[PDB]
Amino acid sequence: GMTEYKLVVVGACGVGKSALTIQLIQNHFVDEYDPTIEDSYRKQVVIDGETSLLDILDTAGQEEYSAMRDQYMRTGEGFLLVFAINNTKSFEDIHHYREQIKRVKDSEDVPMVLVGNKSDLPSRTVDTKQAQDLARSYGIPFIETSAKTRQGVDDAFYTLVREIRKHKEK
Ligand SMILES: *CCC(=O)N1CCN(c2ncnc3c(F)c(-c4ccccc4F)c(Cl)cc23)CC1
Ligand SMILES: Nc1nc2c(ncn2[C@@H]2O[C@H](COP(=O)(O)OP(=O)(O)O)[C@@H](O)[C@H]2O)c(=O)[nH]1
Ligand SMILES: [Mg+2]
Numbered sequence: 001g002m003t004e005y006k007l008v009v010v011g012a013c014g015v016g017k018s019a020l021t022i023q024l025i026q027n028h029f030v031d032e033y034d035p036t037i038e039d040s041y042r043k044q045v046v047i048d049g050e051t052s053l054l055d056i057l058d059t060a061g062q063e064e065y066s067a068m069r070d071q072y073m074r075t076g077e078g079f080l081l082v083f084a085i086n087n088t089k090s091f092e093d094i095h096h097y098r099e100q101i102k103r104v105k106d107s108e109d110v111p112m113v114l115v116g117n118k119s120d121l122p123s124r125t126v127d128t129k130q131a132q133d134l135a136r137s138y139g140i141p142f143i144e145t146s147a148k149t150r151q152g153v154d155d156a157f158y159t160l161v162r163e164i165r166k167h168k169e170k
Pocket of ligand 3: 017018019033034035036037058059060
């Protein structure tokens with residue numbers, strides 16, 4: 001079939017994984033999506049002239065969840081590491097998600113983007129510099145998003161696809 005990219009969205013409960021995914025797919029802001037629904041969503045997109053079918057796993061369950069997730073993690077070509085700028089714990093969790101990804105990818109080199117969500121909120125608790133510096137250490141892009149305003153949403157996913165393309169050239 002057509003060109004596909006397998007994307008997985010991860011990060012702490014409540015960071016906005018679902019809101020980001022729904023903004024990408026449906027172009028609206030959902031503020032009360034069941035925090036427990038884990039499903040895959042698709043979108044036909046054009047990125048730098050390339051038409052592809054994005055397959056996006058919006059994760060929600062505990063660390064050990066299902067065979068279907070294990071399968072999605074294995075096919076996963078790129079990962080959005082999401083935290084919320086007003087939640088220090090979600091940022092502190094980031095290495096945990098990166099560790100688990102590297103584990104499911106047989107330790108291999110994995111396209112990723114660090115995403116600081118909820119950029120619209122006034123009471124920032126996560127230091128922008130700390131996020132930039134962490135992303136730099138990982139060798140990955142850092143993008144600030146708001147699922148509310150849609151700022152950064154396309155950039156986050158499209159950047160991830162571009163990272164996958166680069167990886168595929170090796
Ligand atoms: C509100 C519920 C929610 O959004 N949750 C976020 C994800 N859940 C979670 N908690 C801890 N550790 C997790 C993981 F390690 C992983 C995971 C597993 C394997 C590879 C990569 C990866 F990110 C996932 Cl998908 C979710 C985790 C808690 C609930
Ligand atoms: N202000 C603001 N709220 C957000 C944003 N993204 C998500 N939320 C809210 O944060 C809560 C959790 O979002 P959700 O997408 O369900 O998080 P998930 O558990 O990671 O899937 C919901 O009340 C959303 O409306 C954002 O960018 N800005
Ligand atoms: Mg969710």
